[PDB]
Ligand SMILES: O[C@@H]1[C@@H](O)[C@H](O[C@@H]2CO[C@H](F)[C@H](O)[C@H]2O)OC[C@H]1O
């Protein structure tokens with residue numbers, strides 16, 4: 001409701017306790033944020049689950065072979081443990097933010113550039129062993145503190161085919177299998193293993209993702225659930241389809257986690273307003289309408305969803321700003337009509353507003369939509 005006031009989120013009724021019997025409520029954080037007093041209060045008050053926005057990624061963990069950097073990751077694990085929060089590990093395997101040393105042969109050449117089958121099969125086994133060693137060191141350190149793991153991120157392509165990353169080119173599908181088997185082997189039967197991707201609703205990828213996980217489970221590959229990043233917009237995808245997607249995977253026995261939730265003010269591509277003060281109040285009512293529908297569907301499907309995690313804490317920090325391109329006509333007036341004329345774009349220079357918390361840490365229309373029981 002829009003009559004409900006813009007009160008401080010440190011005073012608002014606690015978001016995790018409202019959903020505590022349906023799924024955990026998480027946020028993606030950066031280690032600098034555990035040094036900001038307002039973010040610490042936000043995390044303490046409102047969330048019971050946590051994930052590293054960045055520092056647990058392949059390049060953050062092992063930038064050179066043998067150089068393991070856990071100081072940052074540790075800082076998050078410590079803080080969650082201190083405040084009884086669940087941890088997700090994002091992510092063990094990815095085609096972005098992954099050091100290039102993974103994919104070089106013994107003479108340091110791009111393993112992809114090899115033509116020899118003999119040298120190709122060699123590079124594959126080397127890549128798989130580098131992977132098992134990467135997963136191994138991480139999992140051994142964190143197995144008793146990090147329950148939920150994004151083993152692989154974003155491996156199915158949007159074209160319905162497996163993403164042709166160096167992983168896929170060099171090692172074929174087996175890099176995926178080696179990934180989940182490594183995590184299970186060193187972390188044991190108590191950590192949960194997920195495959196994590198975006199557009200898990202959009203076809204052909206959705207059923208591509210469905211086929212891949214089904215075949216892998218049929219092959220004994222240990223994968224416990226699906227992660228839906230859920231970088232969505234106010235109107236799309238439909239709650240209908242979201243439900244069809246969560247229903248599909250739950251049918252195979254897989255858990256579902258909303259892993260990177262943010263509701264964008266914009267479309268695709270974004271035509272973003274240049275500042276926060278520049279977004280009209282009505283967009284905040286559209287967004288709250290969606291969050292209400294969205295979180296009602298999450299609650300109906302609570303027995304199929306174990307966690308819901310936003311890709312940030314409050315509107316003052318969201319990676320969505322990097323996609324917030326601002327469009328300027330010839331007279332230099334901002335253009336936000338998706339088809340209107342324009343002359344220049346300033347990429348990543350704009351502001352988005354995706355969370356239920358505004359950049360001054362006061363509750364948005366969206367917070368009230370999901371905190372009530374209507
Ligand atoms: O800070 C940025 C970070 O927020 C971003 O994280 C990805 C966002 O899209 C998905 F949810 C991925 O799994 C995340 O890893 O990546 C770029 C980084 O600079």
Ligand SMILES: [Cl-]
Nearest residue numbers: 317318319320
């Ligand atoms: Cl970011």
Ligand SMILES: [Cl-]
Nearest residue numbers: 358359360362
């Ligand atoms: Cl504000």
Ligand SMILES: [Zn+2]
Nearest residue numbers: 016045047048
């Ligand atoms: Zn709490």
Ligand SMILES: [Zn+2]
Nearest residue numbers: 053317318319
């Ligand atoms: Zn960030």
Ligand SMILES: [Zn+2]
Nearest residue numbers: 006358360362
């Ligand atoms: Zn405000």
Ligand SMILES: [Zn+2]
Nearest residue numbers: 292369370374
């Ligand atoms: Zn509601």
